[PDB]
């Protein structure tokens, strides 16, 4: 209906061409809200899933606490992580910012 009432958005409009050329674009298996639901629940699992042996249990620990274990596990000692917790959070925030 949009391509009849308003018409092509521009030259070479490949969406309005569907009903002219004889082809159809099909919708995806999932809508936007469902896809978002999957990545949202994935986000909430990161801190408590990546932590210890086995995939069967979940440790609902603070994200920050998870990061300090992730850093300790790669060679940064706990004395350093303890002294620099605010520095680490700031650098992390800069990386995402």
């Amino acid at each position: 209906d949009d391509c009849m009432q308003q018409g092509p958005a521009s030259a070479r409009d490949l969406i309005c061409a569907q009903y002219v050329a004889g082809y159809k674009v099909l919708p995806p298996l999932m809508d936007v809200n469902m896809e978002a639901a999957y990545t949202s629940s994935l986000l909430g699992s990161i801190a408590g899933v990546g932590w210890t042996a086995g995939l069967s249990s979940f440790a609902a620990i603070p994200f920050a606490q998870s990061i300090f274990y992730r850093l300790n596990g790669v060679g940064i000692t706990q004395q350093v992580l303890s002294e620099n917790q605010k520095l680490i959070a700031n650098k992390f925030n800069q990386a995402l910012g």
Binding site: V32, T39, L43, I46, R70, V74
Partner: protein, 97 residues
Amino acid sequence: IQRLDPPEQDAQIDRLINGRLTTLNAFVAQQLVRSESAALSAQLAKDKVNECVKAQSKRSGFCGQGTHIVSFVVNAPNGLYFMHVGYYPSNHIEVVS
């Protein structure tokens, strides 16, 4: 059809048919290639969610660059967008060990 009679009309229509059949075959072949490609790629995304997002990876260069700490995933127009947060060292010094 407006201009020619059957003995010549068929020949002209047949040119358009062969051209259009060729186009459709080429289109389908590329959709099959692109589809297969995406399907392989979907497996790769699966591996990265399980390896980089739900876990800390010890694989150099698999997730991001540097030492992997944590990854996040959001949806993208035709797939997933990964944000791999890595630890990047600087100011190396030499010591005796």
